[PDB]
Amino acid sequence: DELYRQSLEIISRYLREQATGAKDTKPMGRSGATSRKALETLRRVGDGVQRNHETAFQGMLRKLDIKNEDDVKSLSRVMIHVFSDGVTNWGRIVTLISFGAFVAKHLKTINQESCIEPLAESITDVLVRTKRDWLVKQRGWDGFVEFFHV
Ligand SMILES: O=C(O)c1cc(SCCc2ccccc2)ccc1NS(=O)(=O)N1CCN(Cc2ccc(F)cc2)CC1
Structure with a gap:
């Protein structure tokens, strides 16, 4: 599940950065x-x-x-x-x-x-399982980046 995989990478890294202040140096793979x-x-x-x-x-x-x-x-x-x-x-x-x-x-x-x-797994699971249809229409994480671009 590529959308779950990508969403988890982004959400778990953000929640870890916010909680601990540490940055993940590991590569993000596909759509990096x-x-x-x-x-x-x-x-x-x-x-x-x-x-x-x-x-x-x-x-x-x-x-x-x-x-x-x-x-x-x-x-x-x-x-x-x-x-x-x-x-x-x-x-x-x-x-x-x-x-x-x-x-x-x-x-x-x-x-x-x-x-x-x-917690990151649980948030990702609910986001993807309830909003996959809307995320496909809105072009997923490309749509997210464009919408908040400044
Ligand atoms: O968007 C809504 O429909 C919405 C509905 C409500 S009605 C009260 C429901 C409630 C929630 C938590 C404790 C008690 C009661 C309040 C705020 C809302 N928007 S939100 O954008 O701020 N929001 C933040 C809270 N998410 C749930 C969550 C829970 C744990 C977690 F780790 C991450 C997320 C839902 C989305």
């Missing part, structure tokens, strides 16, 4: 240029989204009450329930990923770094 451009886009748009939505993000994080792996595993059902309905737009997708980065920072703060990769 677009993946690197999408990750660069997330660094700029994602930082500002977390600052802009800080109050609601703090509130949503507190209600989810994530403290371990078992709490992370139960997030997939929550994301599927909220993200499946309503109109999709790039704003909604970047804010889903930016909230994932906000939760990843919380996971590092509580010394649960081992939960960051399962």
Whole structure:
């Protein structure tokens, strides 16, 4: 699943950078240029989204009450329930990923770094399984890079 593979590379690298500050030096494989451009886009748009939505993000994080792996595993059902309905737009997708980065920072703060990769996998899974049709129409990560280009 090329779209899952590419989406996971971008989302897991962003969530790891945000939580730990470390940069992945490993090559990204197929559609690497677009993946690197999408990750660069997330660094700029994602930082500002977390600052802009800080109050609601703090509130949503507190209600989810994530403290371990078992709490992370139960997030997939929550994301599927909220993200499946309503109109999709790039704003909604970047804010889903930016909230994932906000939760990843919380996971590092509580010394649960081992939960960051399962969280990135769970976000990617919900994005691709619920929005593949819309992502095909919008040209996937090429569409994402173009939409937020400045
Ligand atoms: O786009 C929507 O339909 C939307 C719906 C709501 S109604 C309340 C649902 C809720 C969520 C969390 C805790 C409690 C309740 C609130 C905000 C919304 N937009 S969003 O762009 O900010 N957003 C951020 C939160 N994503 C879910 C998520 C959960 C864990 C995670 F690691 C990453 C993402 C959904 C998309």
